[PDB]
């Protein structure tokens, strides 16, 4: 059967414990933690694309007040439909589960200004989204995982300092 494991979960759940915050900037910001899945179960002989897209978690955006993030007001309009190709795609299944698949080059960003960027609004929360796409088929399958360990406030600038404080013990 079909598996996609998330890499590093341990890893990930030490920053949502904390609640988990990407940077968004005008020319855009790796992440970290990287997103990095295992796959099995895919044909090997097929060829697939891996897209990445990123879920809106909520009808309101978040604030940090006395070290909690709490509700922070109604939300903004729905940043744009932004998915990510993962480069190596398409790709054989056997390219797919020979290692764990790598998001480490996708860049989020505040700013409509090119480059394959995923446009997200600062203040709300968002949960990483892979989806698998089969080549040549006239039914156009694709599958999709979504990652909750994973769930992330994007942020112009650190809310938390023991998030500041991860970034920099775990990166
Ligand atoms: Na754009």
């Not at 996609?4 to 990407?22: D, I």
């Not at 968004?24 to 992440?31: E, I, L, P, S, Y």
């Not at 299944?93 to 090119?114: D, Q, Y």
Request: charged fraction near 20%; hydrophobic fraction near 35%; glycine fraction near 6%.
């Amino acid at each position: 059967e079909l598996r996609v494991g998330l890499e590093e979960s341990e890893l990930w759940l030490r920053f949502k414990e904390l609640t988990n915050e990407m940077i968004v900037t005008k020319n855009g910001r790796r992440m970290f933690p990287v997103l990095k899945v295992n796959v099995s179960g895919l044909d090997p002989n097929a060829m697939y694309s891996f897209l990445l897209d990123f879920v809106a978690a909520d009808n309101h955006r978040w604030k940090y007040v006395n070290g909690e993030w709490v509700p922070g007001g109604k939300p903004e309009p729905q940043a744009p439909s932004c998915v990510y190709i993962h480069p190596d795609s398409p790709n054989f299944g056997a390219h797919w589960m020979k290692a764990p698949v790598s998001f480490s080059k996708v860049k989020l960003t505040n700013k409509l200004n090119g480059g394959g960027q995923i446009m997200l609004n600062s203040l709300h929360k968002y949960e990483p989204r892979i989806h698998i796409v089969r080549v040549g088929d006239p039914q156009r399958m694709i599958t999709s995982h979504c990652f909750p360990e994973t769930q992330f406030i994007a942020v112009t600038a650190y809310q938390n300092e023991e998030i500041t404080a991860l970034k920099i013990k775990y990166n």
